[PDB]
Design a protein around this nucleic acid. Structure first.
Ligand SMILES: [Mg+2]
Ligand SMILES: [Mg+2]
Ligand SMILES: [Mg+2]
Ligand SMILES: [Mg+2]
Ligand SMILES: [Mg+2]
Ligand SMILES: [Mg+2]
Ligand SMILES: [Mg+2]
Lengths: 118, 51, 248, 229
RNA sequence: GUGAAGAGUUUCUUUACUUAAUCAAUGAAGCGGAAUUGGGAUUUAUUUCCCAUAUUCUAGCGUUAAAGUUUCUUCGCGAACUGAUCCGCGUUGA
RNA sequence: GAGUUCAGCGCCUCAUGCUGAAUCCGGUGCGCUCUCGACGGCCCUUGAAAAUCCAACGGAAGAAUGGCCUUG
RNA sequence: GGACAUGGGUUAGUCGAUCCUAAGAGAUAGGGAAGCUCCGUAUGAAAGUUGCACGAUUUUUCGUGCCUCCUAUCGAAAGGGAAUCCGGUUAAUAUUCCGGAACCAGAAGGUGGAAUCAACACGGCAACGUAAAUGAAGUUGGAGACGUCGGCGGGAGCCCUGG
């Protein structure tokens, strides 16, 4: 029992992980904000139209809690296109707007027509 | 450079190829070498003359 | 009346201004090496300490039990210089700057930063130009008698340590400040104690001296030792007053 | 071979970093360890009243082994042994007589502080073994006086924990022997005589002597130095 | 609380202890005592009357062990003693 | 190749397109604003901290070998 | 019309915040307080994230190990601090969009190169140099990091001047 330090420290002990006898919650919740919540609607103002036909970018009203990662996946899953960059802004009315630029191999005008807000 | 810019240089730009290079000046290192040698030699004679 | 100025000096805006201070000036924790032998340190820096007249010395010592170097902050004695070796312990030599038990130094030696209790790390004779004189030893139940800067004689145990020499920083108080602004700068780095309004310049609500149709105290300014706070102003428990002509 | 050269380290003051020695003496221990160590010291100073000081005078090793040899013969029945006895009484209570017809009188050590106290007051305890480390000591501090008054032999023995093992419990403050089988009568009598010579015969003079009051350590060595000069 | 003297069956003064209580320090870091040791006075000597240390150098360096017998079987930065005497009712001091 | 200045052409013109030139060479400072460099004066005043980044001292650890196709 | 009505409008790895600490605020230990709460901030606490491969096939971060002076957090849109510029564009945003041209940080290791035949490069008297030039623990050093006034010397933009 040799102590070469003048300091007693608490010895390490096992520390088991939880093995509950019952799940506290009976049913796991379905994913909140999957893809139908993330994309709310296309935005079709005049400025958004110019973004479509000049910069190959789509303008979406998106959920306040969506980020650039989930907006990218949602657009890919819903409209089968590949954004190259996503810019985001929160409008003065408190709602979130996303500028979704598509790659040079896709045409934003065609995607807009296919969605049907043109 | 600012402190974090030093993280981008190659090793040899941040030092001198010599003992304590980049930490001691050349004349400081020279004082240390000579001082260490002479002090060690004196410890040798004091040990020899102690017996 | 209201709470007088002396009663408000309990903290708050009257705390010491300590941002610019590098560390307390202390002797070194009394350890095995100092109790039985000596340990050597090297003066690394001699530095100005804001709010203190005397300069401080940063002294580097090797740690006896771990691979590391410990830096100590000492009150510099006059004559000390950077690169000097200082020695602390029972067997240290009687040289300016060394730290020794007062019982190990002869009668008449001049010392500074002397401990009141063995190991308190320095209490007596610390301000610029001050020192303590060894007066005598009593070997039976070892107690050393010393003379303090105030002129008082004190008995410290003959294991309380002291630094050989006088505190550096010389005769600072010999120079007239000459200007309010210089007093301003002296106390700016100390505490909120300057300038001072006279009690008689106040109203009765503010101070026992306040009020009256001339500026005067009214009653005696020598007040008893057991006055309450708020009335303990002026010359407290004064044994005498007036211009002394020959004292001891 | 010539490259293997001795490189001694001095270890004097200010020479080499001290080697890693045992610092247990100077360790700052957690509060509970400090408490249980200084508690033993305080009991060493602080002169102990005789009724408490009579404890810490326990049976010697040899007599203790004989006592536990007898006690281990008369252990109480365990839950397994009790369940077996009950199925026997149940089987024999259907076609034969009562449980008395198929089970015999039990021979076992008595335990339980209130139960043993009653046995002593009724002069049925042949031998009483009082544990030496009953923590609220008042539970047993009267037992030697009660045993002496009733003329029942008694011994103070180490480890309430050792007494508890006999009766299949964690601890037991006190055990009592009431009856012993004929084959153990001579051993009980030899233990009773050995116990009595050390405790019952001591009690008259143990009531006056005080425990503790001893300083030890550095203060005693200073006294020894003071005496030697 | 525990002990010692003194004062004309008692409790008053001082002069002792420490474990209560108080103070201070520290990373509770080497306290106290023995054994080896060499001058010493005892003395046709016996540690019996006595405690003896390792770093003063000049602004260096000092850590993660070497060596020493020697046990596996001596393939090994391999295990232990040791190097680093022994012991403990106290972390140290007031 | 941008920007600027200038000159023309289609002339409802459309995607407002198309076509020509120049954008060059010198000097100045107790100037102004900012800044850097080397200094000087002053103080009983000597003028934050931490995150973070770097260097050294040290020597832990490594396993290529068939005179070469072979690893870290 | 800054009024009224209907619509539109704020895009960033590089700008801030976010990270850091400052005066200070403040849980926790522990002690007060009838209590609301007060004091306290490694404090009289068993206050452990980090350093080793002993098992582990076999080409690698899960089990004990022996270890060591660690630490709550909040507190700066002027302090400290990784990194972006020009040209163009809108009715209304832009160092954020568009065109072009860069930079920083992190991860994995995708090629190429370098050193190593036994070991981790050479040159220079030296100050020191290079495309790379093995470096764990521990320690030490540096940067971050600092007042104010005075004149002197340079640079950039501006100003002025000759074609
Ligand atoms: Mg944004
Ligand atoms: Mg007035
Ligand atoms: Mg008044
Ligand atoms: Mg309006
Ligand atoms: Mg930034
Ligand atoms: Mg913060
Ligand atoms: Mg604008």
């Amino acid at each position: 029992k040799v102590r070469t330090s003048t300091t007693f420290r608490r010895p390490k002990t096992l520390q088991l992980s939880r093995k509950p006898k019952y799940a506290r919650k009976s049913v796991a919740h379905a994913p909140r904000l999957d893809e139908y919540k993330i994309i709310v609607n296309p935005i079709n103002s005049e400025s958004a139209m110019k973004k479509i036909e000049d910069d190959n970018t789509l303008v979406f009203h998106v959920h306040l809690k969506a980020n650039k990662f989930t907006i990218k996946e949602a657009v890919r899953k819903l409209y089968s296109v590949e954004p190259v960059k996503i810019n985001t802004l929160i409008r003065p009315n408190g709602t979130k707007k996303a500028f979704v630029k598509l790659s040079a191999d896709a045409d934003a005008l065609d995607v807009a027509n296919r969605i049907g807000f043109l | 450079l600012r402190p974090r810019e030093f993280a981008r240089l190659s090793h040899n730009q941040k030092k001198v190829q010599r003992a304590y290079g980049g930490c001691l000046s050349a004349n400081a290192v020279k004082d240390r070498i000579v001082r260490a040698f002479l002090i060690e030699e004196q410890k040798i004679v004091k040990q020899k003359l102690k017996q | 009346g209201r709470v007088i100025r002396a009663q408000r000096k309990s903290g708050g805006i009257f705390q010491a201004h300590t941002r610019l201070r590098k560390g307390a000036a202390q002797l070194r924790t009394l350890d095995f090496a100092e109790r039985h032998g000596y340990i050597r340190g090297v003066v690394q820096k001699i530095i100005h300490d804001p709010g203190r007249g005397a300069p401080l010395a940063k002294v580097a010592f090797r740690n006896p039990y771990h691979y590391r170097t410990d830096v100590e902050t000492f009150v510099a004695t006059e004559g000390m210089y950077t690169g000097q070796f200082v020695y602390c312990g029972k067997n240290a030599a009687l040289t300016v700057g060394n730290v020794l038990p007062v019982g190990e130094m002869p009668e008449g030696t001049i010392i500074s930063n002397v401990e009141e209790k063995a190991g308190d790390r320095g209490a007596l004779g610390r301000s610029s130009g001050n020192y303590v004189i060894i007066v005598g030893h009593d070997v039976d139940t070892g107690k050393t008698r010393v003379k303090l800067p105030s002129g008082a004689k004190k008995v410290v145990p003959s294991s309380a340590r002291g630094v050989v020499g006088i505190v550096a920083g010389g005769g600072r108080i010999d120079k007239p400040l000459l200007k309010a602004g210089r007093a301003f700068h002296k106390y700016r780095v100390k505490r909120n104690c300057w300038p001072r309004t006279r009690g008689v310049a106040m109203n009765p609500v503010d101070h026992p001296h306040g009020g009256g149709n001339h500026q005067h105290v009214g009653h005696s300014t020598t007040v008893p030792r057991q006055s309450a706070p708020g009335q303990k102003v002026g010359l407290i428990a004064a044994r005498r007053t007036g211009l002394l002509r020959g004292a001891a | 071979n010539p490259l293997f050269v001795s490189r001694p380290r001095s270890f004097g003051i200010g020479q080499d970093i001290q080697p890693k020695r045992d610092l247990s003496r100077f360790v700052k221990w957690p509060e509970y360890i400090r408490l249980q160590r200084r508690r033993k010291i305080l009991n060493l100073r602080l002169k102990v009243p005789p009724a408490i000081a009579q404890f810490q005078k326990t049976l010697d090793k040899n007599t203790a082994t004989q006592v536990f040899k007898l006690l281990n013969k008369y252990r109480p029945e365990t839950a397994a042994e009790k369940k077996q006895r009950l199925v026997a009484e149940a089987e024999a209570v259907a076609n034969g007589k009562s449980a008395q017809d198929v089970s015999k009188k039990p021979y076992n050590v008595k335990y339980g502080l209130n139960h043993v106290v009653a046995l002593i007051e009724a002069k049925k305890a042949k031998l009483v073994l009082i544990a030496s480390d009953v923590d609220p000591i008042e539970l047993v501090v009267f037992l030697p006086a009660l045993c002496k008054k009733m003329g029942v032999p008694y011994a103070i023995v180490k480890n309430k924990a050792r007494l508890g093992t006999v009766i299949h419990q964690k601890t037991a403050a006190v055990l009592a022997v009431t009856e012993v089988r004929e084959e153990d009568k001579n051993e009980l009598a030899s233990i009773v005589s050995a116990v009595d010579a050390n405790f019952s015969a001591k009690y008259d003079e143990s009531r006056r002597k005080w425990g503790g009051g001893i300083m030890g350590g550095k203060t005693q060595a200073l006294l020894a130095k003071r005496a030697k000069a």
